[PDB]
Design a protein around this ligand. Structure first.
Ligand SMILES: CS(=O)(=O)N1CCC(O)CC1
Ligand SMILES: [Zn+2]
Length: 140
């Protein structure tokens, strides 16, 4: 589990979005595994605006943050998980690392701020849904 809180937005994995998220929907994209809902309180997070390929991510199934190198966001085939069938996921970054389903929502961060959240795992990789292209998160 986990979210990003920027301005009056809450960014979660689409597959972990609650009824309250869907009832306060701003934007959602199944192909990216992202959903954004509206918040009452202002968020603590700063979104990275950059093309870094190194950062640190939180792994809840290890209670640990790991430094990783990761691929640039791309359209990638993802094998079936407990929460999606096998499918193509867009805006996905991969790194070598540990990820189980419940690790979804862990933050990946670089020197510029939050890059994305854990979205995929298995076969010794961790996949992250990028948010650095969602410029509208930073205003309004
Ligand atoms: C219905 S779901 O959550 O998308 N998911 C489909 C693939 C299966 O491996 C687990 C269940
Ligand atoms: Zn960066």
């Amino acid at each position: 589990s986990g979210a990003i809180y920027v301005g009056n937005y809450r960014v979660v994995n689409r597959h972990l979005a609650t009824h309250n998220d869907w009832a306060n929907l701003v934007w959602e994209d199944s192909s990216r595994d992202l959903l954004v809902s509206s918040t009452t309180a202002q968020g603590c997070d700063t979104i990275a605006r950059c093309d870094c390929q190194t950062g640190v991510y939180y792994c809840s199934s290890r209670r640990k943050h790991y430094p990783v190198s990761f691929s640039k966001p791309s359209l990638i085939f993802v094998e079936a998980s407990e929460y999606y069938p096998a499918r193509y996921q867009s805006h996905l970054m991969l790194a070598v690392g540990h990820s189980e389903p419940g690790d979804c929502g862990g933050i990946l961060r670089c020197q510029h701020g939050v890059v994305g959240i854990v979205s995929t795992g298995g076969n010794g990789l961790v996949g992250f849904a990028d948010v650095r292209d969602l410029l509208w998160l930073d205003e309004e």
